[PDB]
Amino acid sequence: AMAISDPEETLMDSTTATAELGWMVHPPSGWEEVSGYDENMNTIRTYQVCNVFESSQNNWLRTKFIRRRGAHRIHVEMKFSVRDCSSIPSVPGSCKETFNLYYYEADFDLATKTFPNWMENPWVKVDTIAADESISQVDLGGRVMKINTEVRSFGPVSRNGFYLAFQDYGGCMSLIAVRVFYRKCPR
Contacts of 29 (CB under 8 A, 6+ apart): 51, 54, 59
Contacts of 83 (CB under 8 A, 6+ apart): 50, 97, 171, 172, 173
Per residue, the 3-state secondary structure of 112-178, as one string, reads: CCCCCCCCECCEEEEEEEECCCCEEEEEECCEEEEEEEEEEEECCCCCCEEEEEEEECCCCEEEEEE
Experimental method: X-ray
Query: What is the C-alpha separation between 68 and 182, in angstroms, rounded?
Result: 9
CA dihedral 73, 14, 106, 154 (to 10 degrees): 20
Query: What is the C-alpha separation between 95 and 52, in angstroms, rounded?
Result: 6
Judging by DSSP bridges, how do beta strands 8-13 and 43-49 pair with one another?
A: unpaired
Short-list 17, 18, 2, 6, CA closest to 179: 17
Domain boundaries, the chain: 1-187
Q: Determine how many CB atoms are found less than 10 A away from the CB of residue 17.
A: 16
Resolution of the structure, angstroms: 2.0
Query: What is the C-alpha separation between 118 and 165, in angstroms, rounded?
Result: 9
Q: E strands, 56-97, where?
A: 59-62, 66-67, 74-82
Contact call for residues 176 and 82 (beta carbons, < 8 A) = no
Short-list 132, 107, 122, CA closest to 165: 122
Give the SS3 label for residue 23.
coil
Q: Write the CATH number of the domain with boundaries 1-187.
A: 2.60.120.260
Q: Determine how many CB atoms are found less than 10 A away from the CB of residue 98.
A: 15
Contact call for residues 184 and 6 (beta carbons, < 8 A) = yes
Compute CA distances 145 → 38, 79, 118, whole Å: 12, 11, 31
Query: What is the C-alpha separation between 178 and 10, in angstroms, rounded?
Result: 11
Residue 26 DSSP class: E
Give the SS3 label for residue 16.
helix
Give ∠ CA 81-146-19 in degrees, rounded to 5: 60
Query: What is the C-alpha separation between 63 and 23, in angstroms, rounded?
Result: 5
Short-list 152, 162, 95, CA closest to 127: 152
Judging by DSSP bridges, how do beta strands 124-130 and 135-140 pair with one another?
A: unpaired
Residue 5 DSSP class: P
Query: What is the C-alpha separation between 64 and 121, in angstroms, rounded?
Result: 19
Q: How many helices (H) and strands (E) does the chain have?
A: 0, 13
